[PDB]
Design a protein around this ligand. Structure first.
Ligand SMILES: Cc1cc(C(F)(F)F)n[nH]1
Length: 175
């Protein structure tokens, strides 16, 4: 690896990781599962009612948005959502010990996974949790690739799975 390649891990963190997986959109859109989304992966609601999504947006941002936000507002919401996912892991009796056992890069993959799926969803991968704690990375990655989370929307999940496999940032290189 070049001097520049060795610097690349210092440029990657949970914010950059999720920014790649979720993208950045300033207008309400439907995600791969058809849920109204905005910003960097902010799920507004699971209701099919666009009006509900706009109401949630205005609540979340604190002004009359009519379905559009600024980059700065997207980033604020993004930071709040990342903090929520981290807090969700750390207060959970099942996730915390697994997360604690992980290296820094795999901890990012964990926060990412919880950001995407929510705490109970993630805690439901009983076997994968045990595999991660036991450093059975290949098996963990194979089992993650069976999940509806990955299979329903592979492009959003694939990088995270690879990261659980390797504990490196390689999946986020050369976009
Ligand atoms: C499958 C899984 C476990 C985890 C965590 F949060 F580290 F426990 N995140 N994703």
């Amino acid at each position: 690896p070049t001097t520049e390649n060795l610097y690349f891990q210092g440029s990657m963190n949970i914010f950059e990781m999720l920014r790649i997986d979720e993208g950045l959109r300033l207008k309400i859109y439907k995600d791969c599962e058809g849920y109204y989304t905005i910003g960097i992966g902010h799920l507004l609601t699971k209701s099919p009612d666009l009006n509900a999504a706009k109401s949630e947006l205005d609540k979340a941002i604190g002004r009359n948005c009519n379905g559009v936000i600024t980059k700065d507002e997207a980033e604020k919401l993004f930071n709040q959502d990342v903090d929520a996912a981290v807090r969700g892991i750390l207060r959970n009796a099942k996730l915390k010990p697994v997360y604690d056992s992980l290296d820094a890069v795999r901890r990012c993959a964990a926060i990412n996974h919880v950001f995407q799926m929510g705490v109970t969803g993630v805690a439901g991968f009983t076997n994968v949790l045990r595999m991660l704690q036991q450093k059975r990375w290949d098996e963990a990655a194979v089992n993650l690739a069976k999940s509806r989370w990955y299979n329903q929307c592979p492009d959003r999940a694939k990088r995270v799975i690879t990261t659980f496999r390797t504990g490196t940032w390689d999946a986020y290189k050369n976009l």
